[PDB]
Amino acid sequence: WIFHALVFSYISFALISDKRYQKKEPLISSVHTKVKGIAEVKAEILENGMKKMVSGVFDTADYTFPLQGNSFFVMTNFIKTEGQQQGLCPDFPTARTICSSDRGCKKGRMDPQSKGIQTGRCVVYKERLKTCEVSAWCPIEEVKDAPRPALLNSAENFTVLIKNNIDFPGHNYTTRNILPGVNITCTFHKTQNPQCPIFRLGDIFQETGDSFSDVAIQGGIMGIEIYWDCNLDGWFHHCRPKYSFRRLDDKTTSESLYPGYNFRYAKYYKENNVEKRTLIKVFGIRFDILVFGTGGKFNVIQLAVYIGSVISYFGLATVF
Amino acid sequence: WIFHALVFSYISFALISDKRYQKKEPLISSVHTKVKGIAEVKAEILENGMKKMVSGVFDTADYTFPLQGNSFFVMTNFIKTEGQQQGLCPDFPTARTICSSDRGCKKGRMDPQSKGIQTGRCVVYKERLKTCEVSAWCPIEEVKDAPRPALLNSAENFTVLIKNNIDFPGHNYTTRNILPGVNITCTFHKTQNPQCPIFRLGDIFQETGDSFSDVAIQGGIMGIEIYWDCNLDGWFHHCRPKYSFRRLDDKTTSESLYPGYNFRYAKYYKENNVEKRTLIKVFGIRFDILVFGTGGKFNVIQLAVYIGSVISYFGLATVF
Amino acid sequence: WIFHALVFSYISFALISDKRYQKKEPLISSVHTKVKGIAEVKAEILENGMKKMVSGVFDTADYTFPLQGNSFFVMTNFIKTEGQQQGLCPDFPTARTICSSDRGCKKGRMDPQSKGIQTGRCVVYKERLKTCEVSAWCPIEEVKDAPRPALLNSAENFTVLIKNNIDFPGHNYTTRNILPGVNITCTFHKTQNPQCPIFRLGDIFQETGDSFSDVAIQGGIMGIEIYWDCNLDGWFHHCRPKYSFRRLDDKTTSESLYPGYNFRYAKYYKENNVEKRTLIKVFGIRFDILVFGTGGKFNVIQLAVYIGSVISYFGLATVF
Ligand SMILES: Cc1nc(/N=N/c2cc(S(=O)(=O)O)c3cc([N+](=O)[O-])cc(S(=O)(=O)O)c3c2)c(COP(=O)(O)O)c(C=O)c1O
Ligand SMILES: Cc1nc(/N=N/c2cc(S(=O)(=O)O)c3cc([N+](=O)[O-])cc(S(=O)(=O)O)c3c2)c(COP(=O)(O)O)c(C=O)c1O
Ligand SMILES: Cc1nc(/N=N/c2cc(S(=O)(=O)O)c3cc([N+](=O)[O-])cc(S(=O)(=O)O)c3c2)c(COP(=O)(O)O)c(C=O)c1O
Ligand SMILES: *[C@@H]1O[C@H](CO)[C@@H](O)[C@H](O)[C@H]1NC(C)=O
Ligand SMILES: *[C@@H]1O[C@H](CO)[C@@H](O)[C@H](O)[C@H]1NC(C)=O
Ligand SMILES: *[C@@H]1O[C@H](CO)[C@@H](O)[C@H](O)[C@H]1NC(C)=O
Ligand SMILES: *[C@@H]1O[C@H](CO)[C@@H](O)[C@H](O)[C@H]1NC(C)=O
Ligand SMILES: *[C@@H]1O[C@H](CO)[C@@H](O)[C@H](O)[C@H]1NC(C)=O
Ligand SMILES: *[C@@H]1O[C@H](CO)[C@@H](O)[C@H](O)[C@H]1NC(C)=O
């Protein structure tokens, strides 16, 4: 007769723990995001073999772009190339572009590691280096690694405020991340205050265990996660978020592939009756906010189906 | 014996209503959006305490930006500051920036309400107002409220067409929002025509019950919801959307936080061998389309499971 | 007694096939995308009745825009209009804009096919064609169809590399699209190599059965689908993606509506103390990556619920 109560205890345990008497629903979410703070750049670069001093300040109009859905981007490093006009010009001398005769490169060949189409005229470029000119923006963007000291090493001191508004369309529930009458002068910390939305980039990066400086060379993809586990019943009602973070970039890289998250960005300007761009190579840690959650109620149909399913165990106990 | 039939009536009621014999599947959607119409601006502004006249016309290339996933943005108000070059200049005189001696502000101090880094030299700025210059774009954007009559008050007269294409990967179903052969010369109205996808911004704003002019000062976050509840069975087949709207912005605000949905945008231009931007403070009502729905079929496993579950009530009625 | 074993066979078949003993979880994904390759343009255009030669090269900074969430865009065709200053000028002569007297058009009338607000002065525009000037950017963008040979017909030769990182927050599982130690020098093909993420635009368009050249006139919306069906149990563990493609654009169009996916893009520049833009009409096939998947485990509660549900059939077989 011991199993006659043991089965009951097991069904009670499962019903209380898994919340089978609750009908779960999607989440529907909208994310609002503000990145604040400024950075200051003062350093030295080697462009085209010539030393130059980069000094200045970048504010909220410089180190980001208008919000792209549930995400936001932050400048981290850049390579600048000014005054590029369409024409024919030798490209950057690499292993696949060096030539000693015009026959070395064929006109119209589009090696998937260049910018432009070659014409097949191996001319000198610099220090008697023979390469065959391509039709593209001149001067051709020299292929070089990002500077070892990240230009925006101060970017880890930035702050970000996140407002999440989730919905449960099955029920009549729509709720926000920040409750009214709550202090905003604060910072996020798992133990000190896990409800404050203000996240510190240094903090989010150090919690995962990755040093910001290392990853600032080429950037990466970061994710914040907001989990919502909301009980909509009149009793034991609570709907509150939990914050976690992790790296969506592989971090292991590969010889064929390339680490970081980088892209090239264009800025056109006509001058002297000529057209010329100012494209920049851009390394920047794109953030992806990932918000997900569940919410149940007391729909009696689920309760009935589960009770009727578990009644057979009551039967079987007497059967055996 | 009355319960013997009452149970049967309950189970039938539950099966017909909740559609337990239907295996539900999530939704995969793609949103296409077009915002049309033009606006005209003719007003007066007080910039740097000088009166100026702003007159002109904004068209689809001006009052928006390229679509960002399942969303679209509309210009509502802006504050323009032209000709800003990098250099050291006094900032806007506020409570936290006013000084009487160089000792009042320390060099390198980055108060999180400023643009640029002070050097510690409290000089006059205007009307014998001593503030200490910071290194940033000059002249420093003066902190001012948006004008009381919203520059684009005509923006409520714009129209938006929405094409939703949803998928149900579990089944072989992919459908669209607009059926072929359906008039497009129309406007949305819950009673007149709830299938026409052309929404009027004044209409969507007024349905929720918020006046456009008040929210147009600082903007906010709007959301359209498209609910799909599609029955894929041969019999009683129907798959049609329903439109609803609501405000994802808090609308209650806070003294620490700030209402509306605003951001600063940059437009760079080199002139006289100097670099200068034209950054604009932007207030604009970001729209977020939220599309969700369910679709099921006649998978017999679900039917078998439910019927076996509910058989225990038939037996318990005889038990009791 | 045959049914006594037939029922057991059916329950075993259902449990093995549908995987009822697995608790399914949603998917949380992040998409990284790279589009590579270059294009060359050399053609002739008829702008304002005058022949011109368009020759040049477009690289990764020209034929796209920064990634917008889980999507990417590719230039396909464009109509350029340079030097547009704000002022009053006659618009493009169409059926609704031609007038013979000033009374034909009323000042302040905003026909929803125009750019600018008319003033009601029917003056000559070209070849003794009388239209009434509107206040907008001049010269008014002439309404013309895209060139019959698509300018970027070579865009089908582009390659795209996709890195998908999905999560199963219910379990402790986060995985990537590309496994380590896997060749990247390859191309996608359903039979040759369905794991290589490098997709060829000509390939993706031809698999669906749509010629690239025809859709390149006005563009369209393309969709890649990545299906993940991952078994997280220790035995029979596998978690691998499958690639499919389809057209989210209607492709049937309508007289009232308009085919393709086009938008107008703005590029401002101040010159001669005047403001002027360089807005371009843009036709480009927007790509929408759609990633979805399921993953289950061996939660015993689901197993117990299903077994209890199906025990009733064991009972009913003896009942009948
Ligand atoms: C030196 C350098 N290389 C970059 N990417 N190089 C790639 C990038 C790739 S990719 O990940 O397939 O885009 C390479 C791919 C293959 N492959 O065939 O598998 C071979 C190679 S390769 O090392 O032999 O030339 C690939 C090389 C990059 C990033 O890609 P990209 O600039 O060449 O477009 C940067 C960025 O600054 C860079 O500075
Ligand atoms: C006058 C004015 N103030 C703005 N934001 N002000 C904030 C904004 C914020 S924020 O919501 O935390 O970004 C403030 C936050 C705190 N706080 O510590 O909780 C204190 C304050 S404060 O009122 O004492 O200076 C905060 C003040 C804003 C919007 O933020 P911002 O321009 O300062 O970056 C505007 C925009 O037009 C504006 O015109
Ligand atoms: C010649 C031409 N027409 C375009 N769109 N035309 C529309 C576009 C539309 S729309 O799909 O409702 O935006 C039209 C809608 C309606 N309608 O009331 O249902 C009537 C008409 S109409 O043919 O009589 O003028 C609509 C016409 C377009 C695309 O829209 P748009 O440039 O006019 O803003 C292009 C693009 O280059 C174009 O070259
Ligand atoms: C961030 O700010 C603190 C406060 O002044 C400063 O001590 C620290 O050096 C800053 N971080 C970096 C990387 O400079
Ligand atoms: C918020 O924080 C401030 C100081 O940071 C403190 O004085 C105040 O009591 C806190 N609570 C409220 C409700 O302001
Ligand atoms: C919207 O257009 C109508 C039609 O002319 C006009 O009466 C109304 O004033 C416009 N809205 C605003 C805010 O001007
Ligand atoms: C559409 O509307 C027009 C007028 O708005 C009307 O003449 C026509 O009959 C309607 N139906 C169709 C199919 O065009
Ligand atoms: C794509 O590249 C191949 C390889 O040279 C070439 O034969 C083909 O013509 C190119 N496609 C187009 C549309 O030109
Ligand atoms: C990858 O491909 C290259 C040639 O495309 C081949 O030589 C090599 O064996 C392949 N495998 C690895 C692991 O490199």
Author numbering:
A (entry chain C), B (entry chain B), C (entry chain A): 31 to 350
Quote what the paper states about this structure:
P2X receptors are the family of cation channels activated by extracellular ATP and are widely expressed in the mammalian nervous, respiratory, reproductive, and immune systems. There are seven subtypes (P2X1-P2X7) in the family, each of which plays distinct roles in physiological and pathophysiological functions via homo- or heterotrimerization. In this work, we determined the cryogenic electron microscopy (cryo-EM) structures of the panda P2X7 (pdP2X7) receptor in complex with PPADS and PPNDS. The overall structures are similar and show the trimeric architecture of P2X receptors, consisting of the extracellular domain and two transmembrane (TM) helices, with each protomer resembling the dolphin shape, consistent with the previously reported P2X structures (Sheng and Hattori, 2022).
The structures of pdP2X7 in the presence of PPNDS and PPADS were determined at 3.3 Å and 3.6 Å, respectively. More importantly, we identified the residual EM densities at the agonist binding site that fit into the shape of PPNDS and PPADS. It should be noted that while the pyridoxal phosphate groups in PPNDS and PPADS are shared, the naphthylazo group of PPNDS is significantly bulkier than the azophenyl group of PPADS. The phosphate group of PPNDS and PPADS interacts directly with the side chain of Arg294 and possibly also with Lys145, possibly via a water molecule. Interestingly, despite the structural differences between PPNDS and PPADS, the two common sulfonic acid groups form hydrogen bonds with the side chains of the same residues in the receptor, Lys66 and Gln143. Finally, to verify the binding mode of the pyridoxal phosphate derivatives, we performed molecular dynamics (MD) simulations of the higher-resolution PPNDS-bound structure embedded in lipids. The overall structures were stable during the simulations, and PPNDS remained stably bound to the receptor. In the PPNDS-bound structure, while we observed motion of the head domain similar to that in the ATP-bound structure, there was only a small structural change in the left flipper domain. Consequently, there was no structural change in the lower body domain or associated gating motion of the TM domain. Comparison with the previously reported apo- (closed) and ATP-bound (open) structures showed that, in contrast to ATP binding, the binding of PPNDS and PPADS does not induce the downward motion of the left flipper, which is essential for channel activation.
